[PDB]
Design a binder for this molecule. Structure first.
Ligand SMILES: *C(=O)[C@H](CN1CC(C(=O)NCCN2C(=O)c3cc(O)c(O)cc3C2=O)=C(C(=O)O)N1)NC(=O)/C(=N\OC(C)(C)C(=O)O)c1nc(N)sc1Cl
Length: 473
């Protein structure tokens, strides 16, 4: 059968990301080869094979009318073999993929197996569209949501942060909050898909690795508090003395020099005690509902085989310890894609637009998952988290009002450093998640390790997208 030309993958502006390259496959009729044994050695040497092992193979297939000699020669190598003019040697034009951006977008684009079928990423997810039909009809062009310009920036900054932090791994996702598009998705470690010759390096961690989101979910606990009718931002919580006992469990703040904190101060000081006390007052049910509605631990609908769903704990009757730990993101499992999608809903005034890895021309209707008034109040609080005295100043994006939240998880001393946010605050365009796994220098807090990567990637992304600076007089 005649292998078909696989569809071109492009970025959202038409830059090529996966291109079908002509190769030559050689096959032989042994019955005819066996009439030309004197030609075999120069045919073996032309295929870089030992004369004796080549000869053994043909002799062991003397009564098969077909065998492959080699697959995936360049046309030039295949020409050299054809020019030997060996009886019983034939050629087929096959296709191998080339990935012009290589390691930069390897996890998103994926790659094809020996037979030119998708094995990972978009190549796998859109195989039916890309493949076409073997004779023979060509596969179809696919434009991704990815902007190669934002992807290059995200890739470079996440690489530099891993090296500066001596970290094991990392992910970074950028989303268009208005369209649901994935504009960048990068992971470390990465691989060159044009030279496969580590399984670890091939993992799209942003989609297939789950982690505890920790304190990055506090904005969703606060959304539930503001929607309950029992809380406003200027309300106070007494978090003294920085700890709270629930039977056997102790809730702890890292900084314990607080008594009265307003709701914004609970976020600035990442007080687990403060969010736990609000959680006890409003009930875990309300918080669970917000987290489920923004898609934490829920199917993204992206249909990448091997994509993880994670898990959001649920109860009929929430025990007090589980109520506290839900509200500060302990014992949840989410993906970086889910966390970025949730932040996009908050940024898009509480409307969730379905996630897309393909370029969106006609934007589907969004679902109102949080009330626009609550969403807008939480945005303003997350802007104070970044800008306020004592805030996460390393997330500040010079030129723009940015907003977001740090997290730091102790794994089970190894850490995960998180920052999730959006910008600009006065009409958000972009949501971003930065996850750095096991930073190994003195700093491991999300506000130290991930927040500066957010700042640098957001500064470039907003400028690459010509977003007008909103920090004006
Ligand atoms: C959020 O992820 C929660 C609670 N906290 C941890 C943390 C944090 O407190 N970071 C800020 C640290 N920090 C200060 O307190 C401070 C004070 C001053 O004056 C200055 O100038 C600077 C700083 C400073 O950087 C965060 C955060 O927002 O990054 N949030 N995390 C947890 O409760 C979990 N682990 O907590 C830690 C503290 C990391 C621990 O070792 O136990 C956690 N672990 C999981 N497996 S899931 C969760 Cl949640």
């Amino acid at each position: 059968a005649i292998p078909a030309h696989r569809g071109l993958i492009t970025d959202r502006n038409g830059e090529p990301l996966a291109v079908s390259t002509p190769v030559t496959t050689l096959w032989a009729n042994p019955k005819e080869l066996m009439t030309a044994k004197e030609r075999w050695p120069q045919l073996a040497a032309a295929l870089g094979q030992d004369t004796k092992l080549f000869a053994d193979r043909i002799e062991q297939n003397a009564e098969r009318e077909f065998i492959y000699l080699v697959r995936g020669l360049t046309p030039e190598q295949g020409e050299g073999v054809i020019a030997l003019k060996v009886p019983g040697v034939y050629s087929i034009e096959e296709f191998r993929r080339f990935y012009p951006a290589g390691e930069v977008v390897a996890h998103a684009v994926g790659f094809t197996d020996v037979d030119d079928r998708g094995r990972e990423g978009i190549e796998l997810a859109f195989d039916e569209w890309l493949a076409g039909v073997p004779g023979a009809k060509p596969g179809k062009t696919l434009a991704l949501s990815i902007d190669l310009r934002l992807q290059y920036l995200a890739h470079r900054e996440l690489r530099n942060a891993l090296l500066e932090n001596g970290a094991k791994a990392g992910s970074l996702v950028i989303m268009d909050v208005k369209t649901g598009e994935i504009l960048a998705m990068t992971n470390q470690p990465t691989y060159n898909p044009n030279n496969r010759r580590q399984p670890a390096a091939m993992r799209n961690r942003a989609m297939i690795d789950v982690f505890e989101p920790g304190s990055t979910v506090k904005p969703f606990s606060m959304s539930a508090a503001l929607a309950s009718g029992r809380w406003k931002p200027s309300d106070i919580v007494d978090v003294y003395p920085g700890t709270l006992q629930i039977g056997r469990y102790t809730i702890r703040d890292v900084s314990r020099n607080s008594r009265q904190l307003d709701l914004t101060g609970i976020l600035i000081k990442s007080s687990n005690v403060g969010i736990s006390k609000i959680a006890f007052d409003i009930g875990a049910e309300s918080i669970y509902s917000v987290m489920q509605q923004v898609g934490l631990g829920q199917d993204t609908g992206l249909g990448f085989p091997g994509e993880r769903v994670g898990n959001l704990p649920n109860h009929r009757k929430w025990p007090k310890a589980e109520t506290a730990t839900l509200a500060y993101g302990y014992g949840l499992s989410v993906t970086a894609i889910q966390l970025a999608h949730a932040y996009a809903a908050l940024a898009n005034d509480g409307k969730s637009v379905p996630l897309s890895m393909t370029r969106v021309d006609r934007v589907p209707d969004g679902v109102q998952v949080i009330s626009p008034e609550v969403a807008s109040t939480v945005q303003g609080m997350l802007q104070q988290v970044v800008e306020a005295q004592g805030g996460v100043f390393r997330a500040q994006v010079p030129g723009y009002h940015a907003a977001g939240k740090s997290g730091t998880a102790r794994k089970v001393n190894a850490y995960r450093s998180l920052f999730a946010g959006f910008a600009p605050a006065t009409d958000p365009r972009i949501a971003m998640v930065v996850v750095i796994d096991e930073p190994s220098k003195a700093g491991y807090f999300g506000g130290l390790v991930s927040a500066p990567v957010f700042s640098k990637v957001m500064a470039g992304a907003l400028r690459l997208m010509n977003v007008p600076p909103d920090n004006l007089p």
